[PDB]
Structure formats: C-alpha cells, structure tokens
Amino acid sequence: VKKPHRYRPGTVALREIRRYQKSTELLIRKLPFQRLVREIAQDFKTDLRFQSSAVMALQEASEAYLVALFEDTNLCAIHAKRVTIMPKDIQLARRIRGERA
Amino acid sequence: NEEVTFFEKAKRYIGNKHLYTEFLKILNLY
Amino acid sequence: LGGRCLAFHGPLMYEAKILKIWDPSSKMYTSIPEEIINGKCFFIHYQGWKSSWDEWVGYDRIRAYNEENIAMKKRLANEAKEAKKSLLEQQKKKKLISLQIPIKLKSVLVDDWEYVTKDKKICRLPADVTVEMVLNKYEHEVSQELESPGSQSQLSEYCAGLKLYFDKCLGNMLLYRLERLQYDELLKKSSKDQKPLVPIRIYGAIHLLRLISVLPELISSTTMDLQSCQLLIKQTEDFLVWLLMHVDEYFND
Amino acid sequence: GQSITKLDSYNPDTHIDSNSGKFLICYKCNQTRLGSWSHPENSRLIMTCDYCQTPWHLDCVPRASFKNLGSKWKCPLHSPTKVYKKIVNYKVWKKQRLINKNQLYYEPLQKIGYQNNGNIQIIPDFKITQIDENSIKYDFFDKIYKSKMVQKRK
Amino acid sequence: DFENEDFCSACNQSGSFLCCDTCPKSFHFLCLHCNECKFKIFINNSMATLKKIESNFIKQNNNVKIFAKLLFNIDSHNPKQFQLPNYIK
Ligand SMILES: [Zn+2]
Ligand SMILES: [Zn+2]
Numbered sequence: 001v002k003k004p005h006r007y008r009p010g011t012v013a014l015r016e017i018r019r020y021q022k023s024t025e026l027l028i029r030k031l032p033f034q035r036l037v038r039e040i041a042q043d044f045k046t047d048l049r050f051q052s053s054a055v056m057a058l059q060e061a062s063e064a065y066l067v068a069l070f071e072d073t074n075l076c077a078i079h080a081k082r083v084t085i086m087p088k089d090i091q092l093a094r095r096i097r098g099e100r101a
Numbered sequence: 102n103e104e105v106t107f108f109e110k111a112k113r114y115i116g117n118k119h120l121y122t123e124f125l126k127i128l129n130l131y
Numbered sequence: 132l133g134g135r136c137l138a139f140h141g142p143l144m145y146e147a148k149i150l151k152i153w154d155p156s157s158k159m160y161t162s163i164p165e166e167i168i169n170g171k172c173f174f175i176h177y178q179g180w181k182s183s184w185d186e187w188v189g190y191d192r193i194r195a196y197n198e199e200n201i202a203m204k205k206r207l208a209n210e211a212k213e214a215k216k217s218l219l220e221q222q223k224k225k226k227l228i229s230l231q232i233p234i235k236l237k238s239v240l241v242d243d244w245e246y247v248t249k250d251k252k253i254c255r256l257p258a259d260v261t262v263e264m265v266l267n268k269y270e271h272e273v274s275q276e277l278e279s280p281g282s283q284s285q286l287s288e289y290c291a292g293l294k295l296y297f298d299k300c301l302g303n304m305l306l307y308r309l310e311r312l313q314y315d316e317l318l319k320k321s322s323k324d325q326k327p328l329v330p331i332r333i334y335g336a337i338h339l340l341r342l343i344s345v346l347p348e349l350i351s352s353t354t355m356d357l358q359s360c361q362l363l364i365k366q367t368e369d370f371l372v373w374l375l376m377h378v379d380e381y382f383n384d
Numbered sequence: 385g386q387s388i389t390k391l392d393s394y395n396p397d398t399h400i401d402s403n404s405g406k407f408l409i410c411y412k413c414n415q416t417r418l419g420s421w422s423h424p425e426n427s428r429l430i431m432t433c434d435y436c437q438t439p440w441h442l443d444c445v446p447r448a449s450f451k452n453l454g455s456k457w458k459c460p461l462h463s464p465t466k467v468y469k470k471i472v473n474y475k476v477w478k479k480q481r482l483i484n485k486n487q488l489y490y491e492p493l494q495k496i497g498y499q500n501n502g503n504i505q506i507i508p509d510f511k512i513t514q515i516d517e518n519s520i521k522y523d524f525f526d527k528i529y530k531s532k533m534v535q536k537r538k
Numbered sequence: 539d540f541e542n543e544d545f546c547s548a549c550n551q552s553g554s555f556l557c558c559d560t561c562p563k564s565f566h567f568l569c570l571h572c573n574e575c576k577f578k579i580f581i582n583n584s585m586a587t588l589k590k591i592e593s594n595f596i597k598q599n600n601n602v603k604i605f606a607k608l609l610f611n612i613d614s615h616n617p618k619q620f621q622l623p624n625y626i627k
Binding site: 491492493494495 | 593596600603604606
C-alpha cells in the first residue's frame with residue numbers, strides 16, 4: 001500500500017556513470033590488486049619485492065587501460081544497435097586495436 | 102504446608118519461567 | 132528488542148524489525164504519537180523498506196512473528212489481489228451417550244409425576260430440605276474421610292455446578308404445567324421484595340432428581356471431551372447412589 | 385585459539401553474556417568462573433544450551449568438549465522426547481511432532497483425570513491438551529499420595 | 539408475515555401468550571423477541587463470533603469449568619416444559 005521508490009532500470013546506472021567520470025580515485029580495491037600483481041610476478045621470478053609505488057603504478061596503468069577498453073567496447077556495442085556490452089564487443093575492440101590476433 | 106510451599110520455592114530457585122514450564126512438563130510426564 | 136514482527140498498515144501486513152521499545156511507565160525507550168504514547172508501543176523498521184518509513188506502532192498494529200500471523204498475512208494478500216481482480220473485471224464488464232439410573236428413584240419420580248399431573252398436586256412452597264442443603268451435606272459427608280485436594284476440588288466443582296444448574300434451569304425445564312403458577316407467584320414475590328429468585332434455597336430435592344434425570348441430553352449437547360463426560364457421569368452415578376442411601380429422608384411422604 | 389580451539393587458551397574469556405554484557409551464570413554452581421589472565425587455570429569452561437540459552441559449566445554437566453558440530457546440545461533441564469519404559473514391556477512414548485498452525489488446542493475442564501498422553505501446552509487427533517498450572521500440582525499430589533496409600537494396601 | 543403458533547412453545551398449551559416478532563413461536567407470560575432470537579441478533583448469525591464468546595466465557599468462569607457450555611446453553615435456549623426420563627422413548 002505504498003510501494004518503495006524503485007528507480008527505473010538504467011537510472012542508477014547513469015548516475016554511477018556521472019559519478020565515476022567525475023572522480024579520479026582508483027576503482028579496483030588495492031589489496032586484491034596487489035595480491036594479483038604478486039601472483040602474476042611469481043611466474044617470472046621468485047622472492048620478488050615490490051615498491052608500493054610500483055604496485056600503484058601498475059594499478060593506475062591497468063585501470064586506465066581497462067577504462068579505455070570499456071569505452072571502445074561501449075562504442076562497438078552501440079554500433080551493433082545494442083546498449084549492453086557483451087564479450088564479443090570486447091573481442092572486437094581488442095581485435096581492431098591490434099592487441100588480440 | 103510443605104506441598105503448598107514446594108512449587109513456590111521452585112518458581113524461585115528455577116528462576117526463568119520457561120525452565121519452570123519445562124519442569125512442569127517433566128513433572129506431568131510423571 | 133531487534134526481533135522480527137508483523138505490523139499493520141492498511142489491510143495488509145509487512146515484516147518489520149523492532150528498533151525501539153517504549154515503556155510509558157518509566158518514560159523511556161530501549162534501543163511518539165499521542166494516541167499510542169500512553170500504552171506500550173514500538174519503533175519498527177520495516178523489512179524491505181527505507182529508513183524513512185520507520186514509525187512508532189502500538190500493540191494494535193503489531194503481531195508476533197509466528198506461523199498464524201504469516202498465514203493471515205498471506206490470506207490478506209490473496210484477498211487483496213482477488214479484490215483488485217474483481218474490481219478490474221467489474222470495470223471491464225461495465226465498459227461493454229447413555230446414562231444408568233436406579234429404578235427405586237424411577238418409581239419415586241413416577242409417583243411424583245402422578246401426583247402433579249394426575250393427582251393435581253404440587254410441591255410444598257419453600258421446602259424443609261432445600262437442594263443447596265442436600266448438595267452441601269452430600270459434599271461434606273462424601274469426602275469427610277480424608278484430604279485429597281484434587282478429588283475434593285472435583286466434588287466441589289460438581290456441587291457448585293449443580294447449584295448453578297438449579298438456579299439457571301428451574302424456571303426453564305424443571306417445572307410441570309401446574310408448577311408454573313407457583314413459579315409465577317414466587318417471582319412476583321421476589322420482584323415485590325426486590326430480591327432475585329434463587330431456586331436452590333426454595334425448591335426441594337425432588338427437583339434436583341429431576342435435574343439429574345434430564346442431565347444426559349444436556350451432557351450430550353456439549354463440546355466436552357469423552358473423558359470429561361465419563362468423569363462427570365461417574366460422579367453423577369455416585370451422587371445417585373448416595374441419595375439413594377438417603378431416598379427415604381428426601382422422598383418419603 | 386579459535387574454533388574448537390576454545391580449549392587451548394584463556395583467550396575466550398568472552399563467556400560473558402554478549403547481549404547484556406553480564407556474566408553467563410551456570411545453573412548448577414550458580415557462578416561464572418574466569419579467573420584472570422594471570423590465573424587462567426581458575427577459569428572453568430561454560431556453554432549455552434542450543435535450545436534454551438541456559439549457561440552450563442562443562443564440569444557441571446559432565447562433558448569433555450564443546451559440541452560445535454553434529455546436533456544441537458540440549459540441557460539436562462529439558463523434558464524428554466523418548467520415554468522408554470520398562471514394567472519387559474518396553475513401551476515407547478514419543479512426543480507428537482509439531483504440527484502446522486491443523487494444530488488444535490481443545491480446552492479442558494481440568495481437575496484430576498483428563499489423561500493426556502504426554503502432550504501439553506502450559507497455559508496461565510494430535511490435540512495438544514492445555515493443562516494450566518494448578519492441575520499439575522493436584523495431579524502430582526494425588527498421584528504420590530494415592531500411590532503411598534496403595535503401598536499401604538500391600 | 540409468518541403466523542405465530544397458537545400453542546406456547548414451552549408448555550404446548552393454548553392461552554394468552556406473547557408472540558415473538560422474528561419467529562412463529564409464542565410464549566406464555568408465565569413461561570418467560572425470544573431469548574434464542576435475541577441471542578441470534580446478538581451474534582448476527584456468525585458462528586465464529588459464537589465460538590469466540592464461547593471461549594471467552596468458558597475462560598472467565600473457571601470455577602464451573604465442568605459445565606460451562608451447558609451454562610451457555612441455558613442462557614441461549616428458550617425454556618421448554620419438563621419431561622421425566624425418556625429412557626423408554
Ligand atoms: Zn536448554
Ligand atoms: Zn557450573
């Protein structure tokens with residue numbers, strides 16, 4: 001007899017888009033990314049140490065690359081008359097960029 | 102005398118009313 | 132505090148969690164509209180809703196979180212949706228047991244009936260031995276041997292119930308055609324004296340025997356379990372025995 | 385020092401009543417033992433019953449471990465469910481399983497008799513009888529007394 | 539316009555009687571809407587209300603528990619003439 005205030009799907013998504021394009025703080029949590037970086041590095045040399053600045057630089061580079069990739073992915077998804085990005089969109093973006101063979 | 106004091110003493114020593122109800126259930130099985 | 136509960140809003144239920152419990156006696160809440168401030172009300176946060184809908188609710192609008200209330204909430208939802216569907220359809224349509232008794236007392240009561248209906252006689256006005264006296268003696272002497280609180284409680288309840296029976300059923304179905312005029316005289320005297328009529332202190336043991344005789348239909352017209360029926364039937368038979376031992380004192384003319 | 389490991393350190397001194405911050409008192413000794421960090425040997429393990437949150441000392445209800453697993457612990461203070469009886473005459477009594485709110489509670493007229501099987505709903509066809517308070521008193525009273533008179537009969 | 543009975547429903551005798559306005563039954567002045575119809579209007583033909591009042595009064599009078607429902611029945615049923623034990627019939 002009242003109904004809660006549910007925003008129509010796609011509204012909070014746009015609000016989040018605005019919020020996260022307005023800000024600059026890193027979006028990936030720091031500890032999980034550091035653990036991932038160390039695990040990946042473990043396959044090239046054992047008993048490696050990382051300067052905190054090194055992990056931060058890796059995180060910034062990775063986040064910037066992923067954001068640019070998602071921009072290209074959204075462009076491809078819109079090109080297909082879609083609104084949802086799908087793995088095929090990421091694959092096409094990477095293929096055109098020249099990253100994926 | 103003693104009977105009219107036993108259950109009143111029990112309702113004190115056992116405290117919690119739920120424990121007293123379980124006590125009465127156990128008693129009623131007998 | 133903090134437990135789950137169901138709360139009223141309109142004709143529907145909503146699950147809620149209690150955040151504050153208000154004690155009007157001490158003027159404090161454990162963690163208000165005037166109409167509920169006097170009584171014990173509760174501040175509740177509804178499950179599935181924002182904090183803006185938190186409110187104080189009294190005992191009337193709240194129910195314990197049990198199976199019965201959940202089922203009643205489901206019934207309310209079902210009837211609400213049914214009503215909405217019915218309203219939509221209406222708009223669319225607009226748009227286009229046995230007892231044993233000794234035979235000596237049977238002869239006594241048959242003689243009584245002959246006296247009343249065929250001999251045109253009536254019981255003497257307030258009797259030298261009243262039913263209350265009879266029941267008091269029965270109770271006093273039946274259990275005088277020793278103290279058995281439970282059995283004595285049974286007997287006392289039986290006697291009190293028999294007294295209430297007399298006082299509720301004399302004017303109803305314990306009188307003959309001819310005794311009605313005497314009953315009318317008695318009630319007119321009571322009205323003039325401004326004293327309510329109490330059959331037990333006026334009518335005699337013969338009418339109590341009448342009551343025992345008519346008991347089985349009333350007992351058959353109850354919700355009492357089988358065991359209770361057996362118990363009071365046994366006690367009725369014991370009373371029959373005890374009064375039969377005293378048949379001459381109460382029924383000899 | 386954590387888990388089943390509430391047996392390795394005085395670390396779980398938090399056998400204090402969480403909700404109220406008071407001390408969980410065991411029903412038998414009637415006290416809570418925790419000693420100190422400088423005398424952990426004076427602490428005595430305590431557990432709360434899973435059914436009714438009555439604290440018990442592991443040394444009061446003789447036990448060697450916290451359950452933490454398997455079934456829910458039940459005090460020695462609850463009523464039996466299986467009442468295996470020998471009079472061999474191994475006659476079993478089980479308490480009827482809880483029924484959906486089909487459940488019936490047909491009210492007594494009380495006093496002696498009224499033989500329920502064992503099912504009861506204390507009140508101030510699987511019919512949970514509703515025995516109130518004084519009926520139990522009288523029923524036990526006359527049971528033990530009339531049994532003693534029967535012994536006299538012997 | 540139901541015709542009221544010419545014999546008292548309590549004693550089955552002809553005479554001067556008061557007639558109930560909701561049933562054909564009529565009662566003598568000495569045998570006393572009837573009690574049954576009064577109780578019917580009170581209950582409004584709702585069995586759930588009947589049972590709820592039944593439980594309520596069974597509760598309040600704990601001293602006469604053994605006969606509570608029959609006490610009810612006295613107060614809800616109209617009087618009728620007394621009969622000796624019909625063990626024969
Ligand atoms: Zn327990
Ligand atoms: Zn202990």
